[PDB]
């Protein structure tokens, strides 16, 4: 009498799929009622479905940190077994339970990146250092207007040089409040802070100008996601390519789209703004089939599909692009770098999309 | 009346294929007389064959820097056209002309890496700085015994700190002459050179201990090879997979070998000696199918086949390994790094295999 489980299943079907496509009308059939459908004949899929739905519920009911880990580990052991004998069992089911298991570990997104930032700059007295920033004569209006990426830099400055040091940059703070980090970043390279700590300062300032954590991404922590794509590939390699019948490829970029995104693919804009290189090129560039793909990853947030484009990405990487990267082509590494950005940032904008407290 | 061309062809068939397998008896049929065979019906292949053979001849007759570039550019334009319409033309031919065009640019290996090294350390008075090393009381016996990788480091020391500075390391030079760079590298970390220039010194010393240019590979120049694998992939992606018939896959690792190299694949030794990590693992490691491949690349020097394993490497990279790298798994990047070593080093040991002067 699993009845708590039936409660969990009800919870899935009624309540968590609309988060999964993230769209009420776009492809609801897949998650609302293809996956539950498959879930019955395959226990790894039911286990994944229950564990994911249970993690989603914990946001409200306290309860069940226990059952999530149970169905987690059931789903994993069974799915490990399920891979080796694909004849006995559907592959759409294996793909589903892949993507679901991903989104589940994605919801355990405990990596809060501000800690990571000061990890990098200094090398407890950690939390509640704000008491003297927003409760401060001149840092209030600037901190009160900033976004979270730039609030981080200002907090980093206070931790380095105290509430009353940061208050000294009258011209820059009037500029940051004024949003011209275009040249507010300019006025900060002439700071005697920047002279005495140039490495920390330069990477703080690009954070203020850009928004993205570009300067710090290379040494970033990011790894709770990574372990789950380790085993996840295991089940891509099993099932690829997918049976002519199986519901997945069609949904796969409307099956590519006769490269319709490529006709103005040159014409889509950076969206990263950091590569800032060669990227005005037309067709005759080995980057396009794979920069167009990144555009498509960036271009849509529907949670399941974004994960789907990731899960399928190594079975679809350009043989001519993979070849460059394997050589060591700088553009290749610097748009695979940009992929570890798209990824790390997608979790940041999903768990920021999701309740944290309050 | 191309008769100089017939001379070139004769030159190919009689004289350059045994360099191409690098083995007189191992697979001579392919190059000695399958490739000439195909060469007649396809002009891109004949053009590549002539251009390659002509570059090989220039080593003796002065003549023809001209005809090499001619057949080069003929082969390229025609091969560009030949790719788009594979129905009209064999794919073994396209693969051949790929590999041959590679080995041709490989023979124009003008990158001499000592210049690259001091590029890195300082940032003309370039050549003939030796006059005061081997013609020097105490540096003679050490320089006279060293190999070329370690002669480079000693020369780097003289350029930094003069003939008579380097002569000061009596204990280390007795040790380097004594070949215990095991701890001769130890005695050099306590040098007041190393104190005043630690960055340059540390990377000099690992060069002395290791042999490989590990410390300097990351900032190395290496690029005359790279451009040719750019377009080379273009013709892998066209022809992959190869027609059930075409002579190539069979030769492809005896078609893999039922993973026979994998049964003691854990058991093959580093050969890099720099990864030095995890590499004692057994099977359950996503690195193996691709570290076993690197072993196989390292394990055989037959020039054509080594190039063949490279040309085919992106159509064969592990989907589970490619997936990690795309994430950013450190082991993945640090054994793709080790691949840009195998590559850069293969040219170094082919053109060192080949006549330079004298």
Curated annotation (Swiss-Prot), chains A, B:
Signals that turn on the gene: Induced by anaerobic conditions, hypoxia and cold. Repressed by heme.
Cellular localisation: Nucleus
S-S pairs: none
Miscellaneous comment: Present with 752 molecules/cell in log phase SD medium. ECM22 and UPC2 (in combination) null mutants are not viable.
Role: Transcription factor that is involved in activation of anaerobic genes such as DAN/TIR cell wall mannoprotein genes and YML083c. Appears to bind to anaerobic response elements (AR1) with the consensus sequence 5'-TCGTTYAG-3' present in the promoter regions of DAN/TIR genes. Involved in sterol uptake and regulation of the sterol biosynthesis. Binds to sterol regulatory elements (SRE) with the consensus sequence 5'-TCGTATA-3' present in ERG2 and ERG3 promoters. May be involved in down-regulation of CWP2 during anaerobic adaptation.
Protein name: Sterol uptake control protein 2
Organismal lineage: Eukaryota, Fungi, Dikarya, Ascomycota, Saccharomycotina
Shown part of the complete sequence: 605 to 870 of 913
């Amino acid at each position: 009498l699993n009845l708590i489980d039936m409660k969990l299943f009800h919870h899935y079907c009624t309540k968590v799929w609309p988060t999964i496509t993230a769209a009420k009308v776009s492809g609801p059939e897949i998650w609302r009622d293809y996956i539950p459908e498959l879930a019955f004949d395959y226990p790894f899929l039911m286990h994944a479905l229950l564990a994911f739905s249970a993690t989603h519920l914990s946001r409200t009911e306290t309860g069940l940190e226990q059952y999530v880990s149970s169905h987690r580990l059931d789903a994993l052991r069974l799915l490990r077994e399920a891979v080796l004998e694909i004849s006995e069992n559907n592959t759409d089911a294996l793909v589903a339970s892949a993507l679901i298991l991903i989104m589940d570990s994605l919801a355990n997104a405990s990596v809060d990146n501000i800690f990571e930032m000061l990890r990098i700059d200094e090398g407890q007295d950690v939390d509640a250092a704000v008491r003297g920033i927003l409760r401060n004569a001149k840092l209030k209006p600037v901190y009160d207007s900033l976004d979270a990426v730039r609030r981080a830099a200002l907090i980093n400055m206070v931790f380095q040089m105290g509430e009353t040091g940061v208050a000294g940059f009258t011209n820059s703070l009037r500029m940051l409040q004024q949003k011209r980090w275009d040249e507010a970043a300019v006025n900060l390279a002439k700071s005697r802070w920047y002279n005495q700590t140039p490495n920390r300062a330069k990477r703080v300032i690009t954070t203020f100008r850009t928004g993205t954590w570009d300067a710090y991404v290379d040494s970033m922590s990011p790894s709770a996601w990574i372990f789950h794509v380790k085993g996840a590939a295991t089940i891509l390699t099993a099932v690829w390519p997918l049976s002519e019948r199986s519901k997945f490829h069609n949904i796969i970029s409307v099956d590519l789209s006769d490269l319709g995104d490529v006709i103005n693919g040159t014409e889509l804009v950076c969206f990263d703004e950091s590569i800032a290189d060669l990227y005005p090129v037309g067709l005759d560039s080995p980057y396009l089939i794979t920069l167009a793909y990144l555009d498509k990853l960036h271009r849509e947030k529907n949670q399941g599909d974004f994960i789907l484009r990731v899960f399928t990405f190594p079975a679809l990487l350009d043989k001519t692009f993979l070849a460059l990267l394997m050589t060591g082509d700088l553009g290749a590494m610097r748009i695979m770098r940009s992929y570890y950005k798209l990824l790390r940032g997608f979790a940041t904008e999903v768990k920021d999309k999701v309740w944290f407290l309050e």
